[PDB]
Amino acid sequence: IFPKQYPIINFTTAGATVQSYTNFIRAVRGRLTTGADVRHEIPVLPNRVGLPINQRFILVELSNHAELSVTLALDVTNAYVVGYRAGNSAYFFHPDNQEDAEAITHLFTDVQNRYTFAFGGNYDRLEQLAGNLRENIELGNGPLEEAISALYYYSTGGTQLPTLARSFIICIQMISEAARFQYIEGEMRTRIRYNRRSAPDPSVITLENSWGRLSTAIQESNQGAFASPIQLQRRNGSKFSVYDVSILIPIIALMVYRCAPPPSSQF
Numbered sequence: 001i002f003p004k005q006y007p008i009i010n011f012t013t014a015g016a017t018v019q020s021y022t023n024f025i026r027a028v029r030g031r032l033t034t035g036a037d038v039r040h041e042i043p044v045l046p047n048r049v050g051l052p053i054n055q056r057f058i059l060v061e062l063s064n065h066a067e068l069s070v071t072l073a074l075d076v077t078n079a080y081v082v083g084y085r086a087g088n089s090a091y092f093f094h095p096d097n098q099e100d101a102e103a104i105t106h107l108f109t110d111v112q113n114r115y116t117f118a119f120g121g122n123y124d125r126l127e128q129l130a131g132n133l134r135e136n137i138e139l140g141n142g143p144l145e146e147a148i149s150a151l152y153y154y155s156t157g158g159t160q161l162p163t164l165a166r167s168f169i170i171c172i173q174m175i176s177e178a179a180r181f182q183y184i185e186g187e188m189r190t191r192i193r194y195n196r197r198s199a200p201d202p203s204v205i206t207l208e209n210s211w212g213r214l215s216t217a218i219q220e221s222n223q224g225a226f227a228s229p230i231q232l233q234r235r236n237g238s239k240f241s242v243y244d245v246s247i248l249i250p251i252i253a254l255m256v257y258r259c260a261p262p263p264s265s266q267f
């Protein structure tokens with residue numbers, strides 16, 4: 001068979017319970033990073049520069065209430081959704097470079113049908129197709145169920161790219177972004193409990209737009225002190241400035257590898 005299969009984590013849009021989602025995200029997090037290499041207490045993702053293909057991706061099996069199954073391919077280096085497998089058909093986003101395309105040539109290799117989009121799943125482009133911004137795309141267990149279904153039905157015919165793109169944006173935020181920020185995870189949990197389905201408010205949006213930035217600052221921050229104030233956005237849109245790692249402790253969960261580690265302070 002394929003030289004070792006990447007670890008898969010299951011999640012179903014059936015028993016909508018807060019803890020099931022918490023366990024889901026928790027598993028994904030621990031599945032991505034080994035736990036070592038933490039810049040100022042915050043965990044760091046493996047550097048792609050020396051990360052072998054056999055340690056490049058993670059899979060997430062999404063079961064729908066109507067017994068549907070889709071498997072997304074997450075990139076360990078930054079929880080990037082590269083594609084998915086709808087049964088025996090696979091779809092991947094247009095890679096940004098050679099190495100990535102070469103790396104992509106490993107996911108769902110046993111598929112009878114394999115395809116690659118002309119566009120990229122990156123928010124900026126994905127939103128164009130969806131014809132709606134993230135602030136107009138609702139999140140929650142409800143929208144998630146719909147999303148998973150849409151991905152599954154792409155291969156049949158009833159696809160509609162706008163809907164397809166929107167479906168991806170949902171899965172991305174609820175799975176990937178939720179793992180990146182404990183804060184976002186909480187937002188989804190709040191929704192699920194009260195069976196609430198709503199669009200991500202300013203605070204959530206900004207964090208997504210600042211993941212890499214924060215990762216850079218947190219790593220280059222001497223003794224935790226941020227070299228320059230990073231203006232984040234509050235729930236009502238009003239901007240507030242962050243000055244230290246301390247504030248981000250309960251917020252950010254995972255950081256992308258930026259620079260070389262310090263004198264291996266993790267022990």
Ligand SMILES: Cc1nc2c(=O)[nH]c(N)nc2o1
Nearest residue numbers: 079080081121122123176177
């Ligand atoms: C976390 C994450 N953000 C994105 C994005 O914007 N696009 C794609 N394709 N995958 C992602 O994964």
